[PDB]
Point group: C2
Amino acid sequence: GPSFPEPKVVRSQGGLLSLKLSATPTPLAIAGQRATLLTYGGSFPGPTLRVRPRDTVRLTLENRLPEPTNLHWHGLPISPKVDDPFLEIPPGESWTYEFTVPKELAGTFWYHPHLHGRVAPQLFAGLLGALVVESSLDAIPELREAEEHLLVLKDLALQGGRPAPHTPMDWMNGKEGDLVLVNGALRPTLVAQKATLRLRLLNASNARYYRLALQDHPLYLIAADGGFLEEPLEVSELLLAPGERAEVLVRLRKEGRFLLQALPYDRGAMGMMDMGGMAHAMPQGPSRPETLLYLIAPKNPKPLPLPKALSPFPTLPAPVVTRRLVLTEDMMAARFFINGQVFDHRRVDLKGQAQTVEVWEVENQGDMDHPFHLHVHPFQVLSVGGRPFPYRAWKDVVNLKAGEVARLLVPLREKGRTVFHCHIVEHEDRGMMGVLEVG
Amino acid sequence: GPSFPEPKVVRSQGGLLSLKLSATPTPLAIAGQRATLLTYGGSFPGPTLRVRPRDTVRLTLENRLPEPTNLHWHGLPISPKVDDPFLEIPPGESWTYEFTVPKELAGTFWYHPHLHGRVAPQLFAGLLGALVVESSLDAIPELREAEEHLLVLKDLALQGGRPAPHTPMDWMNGKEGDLVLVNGALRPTLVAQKATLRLRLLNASNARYYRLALQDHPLYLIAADGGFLEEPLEVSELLLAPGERAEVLVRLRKEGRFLLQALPYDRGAMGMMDMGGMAHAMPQGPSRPETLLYLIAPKNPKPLPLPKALSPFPTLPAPVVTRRLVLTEDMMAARFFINGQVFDHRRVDLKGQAQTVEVWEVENQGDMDHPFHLHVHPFQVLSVGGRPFPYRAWKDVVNLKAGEVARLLVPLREKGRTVFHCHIVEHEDRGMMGVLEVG
Ligand SMILES: [Cu+2]
Ligand SMILES: [Cu+2]
Ligand SMILES: [Cu+2]
Ligand SMILES: [Cu+2]
Ligand SMILES: [Cu+2]
Ligand SMILES: [Cu+2]
Ligand SMILES: [O-]
Ligand SMILES: [O-]
């Protein structure tokens, strides 16, 4: 096949993407070994769904797992009566998700399980896939002529030909695996045919962070989780926390082989040590560096000029309320809290008004990084750690290091009950989630 | 007695004001006639209570009326568990109100009934009195040396030696009376002994407005409902809506007699006419001019200089929420609404957080003036009708003409359930009231 493996794409046809996917234990070849994973559509990752604004999506999910499951349409500003985080599809049963893709939308999104208490093992086992919303912006020459690829960043650990089970330490830290894969492949080679690459990036890992850097090259950020920036932003590196997406342009500068690496990053994961009276928690420190893929540039690369503009960011109405949400930890209990409470599906934590704008101040009072995710209502990150964000774009996950406060501008869109939670999914399963009702 | 009648004063003693008042039908002489009014302490108005910050008030109210009653400590930022708008004292029963006067407080306040559905007739019949909080500011020479008087502005109508009953039109408009009185007196004469007067003004009428003007003189506003301004403000006239208070300095310019008048003012009261197929509502138009009192200046008046400063207004924290409250009317039904609803003592309308600041936008979509009152939590009026307020001071009633929006900065103080309502008390009785819970 193609030197660079990417998930098979399923495209809408005549404005309709109608598809049946099964969630199923699936024997497959992975990183040179045979393993049984849990997959959508018989593959890992699941198929990439490619749609345009105003398309209808009709996705029937058949549950062939021995436990209940559901789907979260991560990042899609649709109704929480469709993207329903409380729905359970029992084993053997099916459910059809039907929605219209919003008109003002573009970027890389994804789908995965969201059944409280069971997300971490289901996602770790291989249940996830991408969804791309194509834009009229993709037709401008500076993007149209680029070579485009999707990179699904997901790690895995295998034991006895199956996903490794969660340990107690895994529930505390979030589980990371030794197999650090791209599109389910181990350090694939991307032999570029064009000098400009457009890469859609997705961190679909449970807990692993990717401090991305391409040898000898900057990256040009053109989209965040939920939409384009207003103009390209040059960066030396790009951190992708669990659940985040980004799109970058790469402008290959000369012939040769360039490594795309996940550089060392300390997210505050913890170990245990005993030093003669100890038996106490100790930092794991930074991750070991990982090579994600080998990028081979073509001969005499002459990259395209960058687009001078992308999409203007909407002018939002003045906000009508300010919220404060404080994240804390009980590491040894592996319990995680928002404003001193654990999730309760029956309890409403915030009540807001549709079509108003709110300011959310999310403060991390723990020692671990926590990537904070809000369903249904994409937000504009104003600042984090007291540093203004260097661009305007829609996001739906924001990483907070220990001590940091993020200030978000949150326009409330669809009415209904939905959730916000840490996207280290073990933390969500262990209580770090709350309920927002919009009316 | 003294040419100028004022209510008898009861002062705290050794930091305690302990007093038993009875609410009772009382035969008395009023405006040259005998009448039976409902009074506190056997007088109309009731006694003026004079206290200082940190004083303890222990007021036992004995109800000798044939119906239930209670007290509202209008303007006092104390606990709604003391100033309890839901409490009922049955006929024959007593209740003791006990509270400490807040440290940062000064001005003219008042007490009157607040039993929903019965306020208008009880207040109209004579149940009200003033409460003055003395300040260390009263010791500055420019105030200490002034001649001070309280003016309780209250009108009345008599029928068969008793307060005139409410008609249906009265419930729609709010009841006004033909006897326009000051301290229960008909056009008293104030023979000034000093060239500078300090006048504490209280509008204790059900619905009548007083567009105040002193012939040939400006007034110098030094306090609003709930506290001093930052510096004196010269005005040509001063409108006092029902429930409002103000304190002014008068600087008598030459010898002679000067009328203090209530100038014509159109608050949007309505009548009914039939012109050959009519039978429809028609504006009453402006009130007829009234003389309130005769002010006689002394010989060769040489007024004191004005104080250069009064009290600095507190710097408030940034607000955390913006509220919108819309007032509407059904005149022919005499029903009055806030955000489309009538009062329900069981329903909580707004929930706020103690020690935060809110912005309240109150919009009058009716045709009548409505004076909006909030219990427990004094506010800073930022603007009304899109015009910035010309001073900073604590208020607790704000008048809105037809169409006007008032923008208020509302620091939430004591926790508990309290109310906000129109202070045309007929309108409150007929539904124009809502519930705020602070936690
Ligand atoms: Cu997600
Ligand atoms: Cu977390
Ligand atoms: Cu979620
Ligand atoms: Cu009042
Ligand atoms: Cu009113
Ligand atoms: Cu009241
Ligand atoms: O999620
Ligand atoms: O009141």
